[PDB]
Write a protein that binds this ligand. Sequence first.
Ligand SMILES: *[C@@H]1O[C@H](CO)[C@@H](O[C@@H]2O[C@H](CO)[C@@H](O[C@@H]3O[C@H](CO)[C@@H](O)[C@H](O)[C@@H]3O)[C@H](O)[C@H]2NC(C)=O)[C@H](O[C@H]2O[C@@H](C)[C@@H](O)[C@@H](O)[C@@H]2O)[C@H]1NC(C)=O
Ligand SMILES: *[C@@H]1O[C@H](CO)[C@@H](O[C@@H]2O[C@H](CO)[C@@H](O[C@@H]3O[C@H](CO)[C@@H](O)[C@H](O)[C@@H]3O)[C@H](O)[C@H]2NC(C)=O)[C@H](O[C@H]2O[C@@H](C)[C@@H](O)[C@@H](O)[C@@H]2O)[C@H]1NC(C)=O
Ligand SMILES: *[C@@H]1O[C@H](CO)[C@@H](O[C@@H]2O[C@H](CO)[C@@H](O[C@@H]3O[C@H](CO)[C@@H](O)[C@H](O)[C@H]3O)[C@H](O)[C@H]2NC(C)=O)[C@H](O[C@@H]2O[C@@H](C)[C@@H](O)[C@@H](O)[C@@H]2O)[C@H]1NC(C)=O
Ligand SMILES: *[C@@H]1O[C@H](CO)[C@@H](O[C@@H]2O[C@H](CO)[C@@H](O[C@@H]3O[C@H](CO)[C@@H](O)[C@H](O)[C@H]3O)[C@H](O)[C@H]2NC(C)=O)[C@H](O[C@@H]2O[C@@H](C)[C@@H](O)[C@@H](O)[C@@H]2O)[C@H]1NC(C)=O
Ligand SMILES: *[C@@H]1O[C@H](CO)[C@@H](O[C@@H]2O[C@H](CO)[C@@H](O)[C@H](O)[C@@H]2NC(C)=O)[C@H](O)[C@H]1NC(C)=O
Ligand SMILES: *[C@@H]1O[C@H](CO)[C@@H](O[C@@H]2O[C@H](CO)[C@@H](O)[C@H](O)[C@@H]2NC(C)=O)[C@H](O)[C@H]1NC(C)=O
Lengths: 254, 254, 152, 152
Amino acid sequence: HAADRIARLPGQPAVDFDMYSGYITVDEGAGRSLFYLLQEAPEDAQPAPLVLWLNGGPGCSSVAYGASEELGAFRVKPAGAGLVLNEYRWNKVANVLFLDSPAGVGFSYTNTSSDIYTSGDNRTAHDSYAFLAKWFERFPHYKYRDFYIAGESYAGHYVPELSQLVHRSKNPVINLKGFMVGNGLIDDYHDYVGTFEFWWNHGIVSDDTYRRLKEACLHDSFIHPSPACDAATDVATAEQGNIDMYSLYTPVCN
Amino acid sequence: HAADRIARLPGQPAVDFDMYSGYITVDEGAGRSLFYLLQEAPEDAQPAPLVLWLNGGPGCSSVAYGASEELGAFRVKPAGAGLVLNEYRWNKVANVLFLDSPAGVGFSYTNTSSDIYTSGDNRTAHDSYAFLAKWFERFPHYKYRDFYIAGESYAGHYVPELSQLVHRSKNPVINLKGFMVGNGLIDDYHDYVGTFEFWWNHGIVSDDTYRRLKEACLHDSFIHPSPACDAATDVATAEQGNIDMYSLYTPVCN
Amino acid sequence: SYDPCTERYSTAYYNRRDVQMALHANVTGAMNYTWATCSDTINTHWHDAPRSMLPIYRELIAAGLRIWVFSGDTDAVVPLTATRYSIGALGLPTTTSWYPWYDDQEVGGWSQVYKGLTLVSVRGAGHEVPLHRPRQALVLFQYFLQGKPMPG
Amino acid sequence: SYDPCTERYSTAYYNRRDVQMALHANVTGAMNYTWATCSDTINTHWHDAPRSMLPIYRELIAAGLRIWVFSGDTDAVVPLTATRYSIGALGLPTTTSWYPWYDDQEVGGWSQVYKGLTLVSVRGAGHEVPLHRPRQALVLFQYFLQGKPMPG
Ligand SMILES: *[C@@H]1O[C@H](CO)[C@@H](O[C@@H]2O[C@H](CO)[C@@H](O[C@@H]3O[C@H](CO)[C@@H](O)[C@H](O)[C@@H]3O)[C@H](O)[C@H]2NC(C)=O)[C@H](O[C@H]2O[C@@H](C)[C@@H](O)[C@@H](O)[C@@H]2O)[C@H]1NC(C)=O
Ligand SMILES: *[C@@H]1O[C@H](CO)[C@@H](O[C@@H]2O[C@H](CO)[C@@H](O[C@@H]3O[C@H](CO)[C@@H](O)[C@H](O)[C@@H]3O)[C@H](O)[C@H]2NC(C)=O)[C@H](O[C@H]2O[C@@H](C)[C@@H](O)[C@@H](O)[C@@H]2O)[C@H]1NC(C)=O
Ligand SMILES: *[C@@H]1O[C@H](CO)[C@@H](O[C@@H]2O[C@H](CO)[C@@H](O[C@@H]3O[C@H](CO)[C@@H](O)[C@H](O)[C@H]3O)[C@H](O)[C@H]2NC(C)=O)[C@H](O[C@@H]2O[C@@H](C)[C@@H](O)[C@@H](O)[C@@H]2O)[C@H]1NC(C)=O
Ligand SMILES: *[C@@H]1O[C@H](CO)[C@@H](O[C@@H]2O[C@H](CO)[C@@H](O[C@@H]3O[C@H](CO)[C@@H](O)[C@H](O)[C@H]3O)[C@H](O)[C@H]2NC(C)=O)[C@H](O[C@@H]2O[C@@H](C)[C@@H](O)[C@@H](O)[C@@H]2O)[C@H]1NC(C)=O
Ligand SMILES: *[C@@H]1O[C@H](CO)[C@@H](O[C@@H]2O[C@H](CO)[C@@H](O)[C@H](O)[C@@H]2NC(C)=O)[C@H](O)[C@H]1NC(C)=O
Ligand SMILES: *[C@@H]1O[C@H](CO)[C@@H](O[C@@H]2O[C@H](CO)[C@@H](O)[C@H](O)[C@@H]2NC(C)=O)[C@H](O)[C@H]1NC(C)=O
C-alpha cells in the first residue's frame, strides 16, 4: 500500500492530500490486473467516505476521463505539459477511487489477448468485485468506511450491476451505502424513445428521420442495434453535422 | 423628410450612414400618430432594400428592442450613458425601418385615450398600412424599392396580417417581395402542443404539469387563455424558477 | 459579451430629453407618462386576434412571396417545436431536407427548404436572435435578402 | 474557461514515461500499445448486457440503498428525456415534485424526489457534468454524500 504511494507527478502542483496508484490482480489465471488511482481528501476532512468512480464507453478510462477532465484533483495542460489544480475537485469531501475497467482499458491489462474480444457486463462486474475485495486488504484502514459507487453513461450498467454483487456478497468490510449515476443507460426501450424525442426537440434531426429512428430501433439494444437501426442512425448523424453531441452548445475541438 | 433627419444622438459614435425619425399620422380623427426610426445603409451599399422590422408583445416597442438591443445600429450603455456601435447591425446591407406600433407603444401615441384599451390585430394592421402609404410620400426616393417585412414573436401575427393588406392593396409604389418571422406565433393549437413538449424536453416542468397543461390549454388561444389554462400555467411558472424563459442557458439580470 | 440587463439601460436612455429632442419625439412633451419598453395596458387589453395564420401563409405562398421562418433554439416562450408543428401543418413538400448550415467552421443552426417556404433554426440563440447570436443572425438576414438557401 | 480539446492533452501526458513511472504503471513497459482514452476493440467487441437495469434498481430500493440519478440537460448522447422515461417506468411515488434547485442565486437544475430515489438535472451541462458545470457538480456531490435534497 505504502508502495503504491505517489510522491509527485510531473508538472504537478504542490497539494495537501495524498494520492495512490497501482495494480490489483483480479484473475491470476488469465493474468488480468486492474489499475486504480486514489485521490484522498485532506486530513482535516477525515475520515471521509470512499467513492468508487467508473467511466463508461464501454471501453473508456476512468483515469482518462473521471480523474483528468472531470472530477479529479487535476487538469492537464495543452500539449500535455503539466497539471493544474481542479478548484471543484471531488476529493475535497471524499476519498475518490478511479478504476480502469475492464482489463484492456487505460493502464489496465490482461495477459490473455483473447480477453479483449470477449468483454461483457458479467465478467466486468465480477472482476470489479474481486478488485474491491483485495483493495480493502491492501488498504485495511478503509474497511468499514461508508462506501458509494458512482459513474457516467455506460456505467449506468456497471454501477448497478456491481452494486448488486457487493450487496449480495454480504462482505462485512464493505459498507455500501449507495450509488449514483449520471447520464446513463437505464432501460433500452425507454432510453431510445427518449433519445429520439429529445433530438427532435433540440432541432437536430428531421421529421422523417425521427420517425424512421423510432420505427428502426425500438426493439433494439443500445449496444447492439440492428442494421435497420444503423441505417436510420447514419442519416441522423448526417443531419446533426459537425457538433459535439455530448454538449450541444459548446464548440468542437480543432 | 429632411426635417426628420437626425444629426446626432447623445453619446452617439460617428457613423457613415444617415438616420431619420419622426411621426406619421395614421388617424386624424382619433389623433393616432406612429413614430418610426430609419437607419439607412451606407452610400456604397445603395440603393439597398427597405426592411420594416416589427417587435411583438403585443405592446412592445420595435425601437426599444429591435433598434436598441437587437439588429439596430447601436447598443445602449449601462446607466443609459451613451451608445456603442453594433458590429453586426443589419443596416450594413439594408435600409431598416423600425415602427412603434400600435398607437400607445414606445414614442407612438394616440389622442383618444380609449384607444389603448381596445387594441386588436385588425386595427393594428390597418394603421400600419396607412403609416406605410404616407411614409412613401414623405420619402419618395423609396418608391419601387424592393420591400420586406420582418419581426419576432407576437409579430407572427403582425407581419403576415400586414403583408396580406399590402398585397391586396395593390399600391404600385410598394414593391413587397416578402416577409420573415422569428420565434413567432403561427397557429394557436400547434404552438401550444409544441411549447409544452419542448418544455418537458428541456427539464422545465414535471410530468404531471405537462399533462395538466395539455389538458387545460388545447382549446385555447395564446392571447386569451382560459382560467383552467391560467391555473395550469401558474404551477409551471413555479416549477421553472428563476430563469430567463427567453434564453434558457444565459443569466438573469440582477 | 452578453449583458442580460440591456432593457434597463434602454429605459434610462430613452427617458432623457436630450435624446427625445434628438429623435424628434414627444416634441410637445405631451406624452403624459414615462417611456417604457412595452405597454402593459396594451398588453393586458388586447382584443381581436385570429387563432391561425395558416390561411394567410397559404394565400401569400400562392401569391409567390418569399417567406422565411426562423427560430432561436434555446427560447422557451415561442419555442422551436411549436414552429416545427405549425409549419408542418401547412403540408408543403420538401425540396431540401433538414440539414446543418455553417458560419465558418461551426454549425450555425439547421435548415429545411419546402416548396414556398424556408425554415431556419439558430443554434444556441434565445428569443431575440440578433442579441444572442448577432453574427449568425446577419448571415441569416443576408441569405434571405438574396433568396439563397443557408449555406454549407 | 472551457477547452473542448482536453482529450488531446491527456493523450500526450499519459504517454510520457516520466508520468507512467510516477504512477507505477506499465512498469515493465510491457504494455504493447500506446495509451488511449478508450479502447476501440473493447468498444466494438462487447458481448453480454441486459436490456434493462430496472429490475436491479428495484432490488436495491427494496434493500434501502441511497440511489441518485442525474443528468446534464444539454447532452444528446444519453439525454435527459431518456432518463425521465426510464425512471418514470419504475413507478415510484413522488415525495417532492419537480422543483428548481439553486446554487447562489442562479437555478442549478431541477429535482424530483421519489420514494427510494432522487432525480437531479444539471442546467446547461453536457454529458460530462463536472467538466461543464464543475461548481454545480460539487454541490450535487456534497448533497448526495449527505442524503439531503437539492437546495433552495
Ligand atoms: C503478465 O505477464 C507478464 C509477462 O510475463 C508477467 O511478468 C512476469 O512476472 C513473472 C511472475 O510473477 C516473473 O517471472 C519469474 O520471476 C523471477 C524473477 O525474479 C524468475 O526467477 C522466474 O524464472 C521468472 O522470471 C517475470 O520476471 C515477469 N516478467 C516481466 C516482464 O515482468 C506477469 O506475471 C506477473 O506480473 C507481475 C509483475 C506480478 O503480477 C507477478 O506477481 C505476476 O504473476 C503477468 N501479470 C499478471 C499475471 O498479472
Ligand atoms: C394630439 O393632441 C395634441 C394636443 O392637442 C395636438 O397638438 C396641437 O396641435 C394643434 C393642431 O394641428 C395646434 O392647434 C392650433 O395651432 C395654432 C398654433 O399655431 C393655433 O393658432 C390654433 O388656435 C391652435 O393652437 C396646437 O398648437 C397643438 N398643441 C400642442 C401641445 O402641440 C395634436 O394635434 C396636432 O399635433 C401636431 C403637432 C400635428 O399632428 C398637427 O398637425 C395635429 O393636428 C394631436 N396630434 C395628432 C392629432 O396627431
Ligand atoms: C458471470 O461471471 C461469473 C464469474 O466470472 C461466472 O461464474 C464463474 O463460472 C466459471 C466458468 O464460467 C468458473 O470458472 C472456472 O471454475 C473452475 C474453478 O472451480 C475452474 O475450471 C477454473 O479455474 C475457473 O475458470 C467460476 O468458478 C465462476 N465464478 C463464480 C463467482 O461462480 C458466471 O458464469 C456462470 O457461473 C459459474 C459459477 C457457472 O454457472 C459457470 O459454469 C457459468 O458460466 C457468469 N454469468 C454468466 C453470464 O454466465
Ligand atoms: C378592420 O379595420 C378596418 C379599418 O379600421 C375596418 O373598416 C373600417 O370600418 C370603419 C367602421 O368600423 C369605417 O370608419 C368610419 O367610416 C366612415 C367613413 O366613411 C365614418 O363614419 C368615420 O369617419 C369612420 O370612422 C372605415 O371607413 C373602415 N375602413 C376601411 C379601410 O374600410 C374593419 O371593420 C369593418 O370594415 C368597415 C369598412 C365596415 O365593414 C365597418 O362597418 C366594419 O366594422 C375592421 N374589421 C373588423 C374586425 O371588423
Ligand atoms: C414627454 O415629455 C414629458 C415632459 O418632460 C415627460 O414628462 C415627464 O414626466 C416625468 C416622469 O417620468 C416628470 O418627473 C417630469 O417632470 C417630466 N415632465 C413633465 C413636465 O411632466 C414624459 O415622460 C415624456 N413622455 C414619454 C417619455 O413618453
Ligand atoms: C508501455 O511502455 C512501453 C515502453 O516504452 C510503451 O511502448 C512504446 O511504444 C511506442 C509507441 O507509442 C514506441 O515508439 C516506443 O519505443 C515505446 N517503447 C517500446 C520499447 O516499445 C507503451 O506505449 C506503454 N504502454 C502503454 C502506454 O499502455
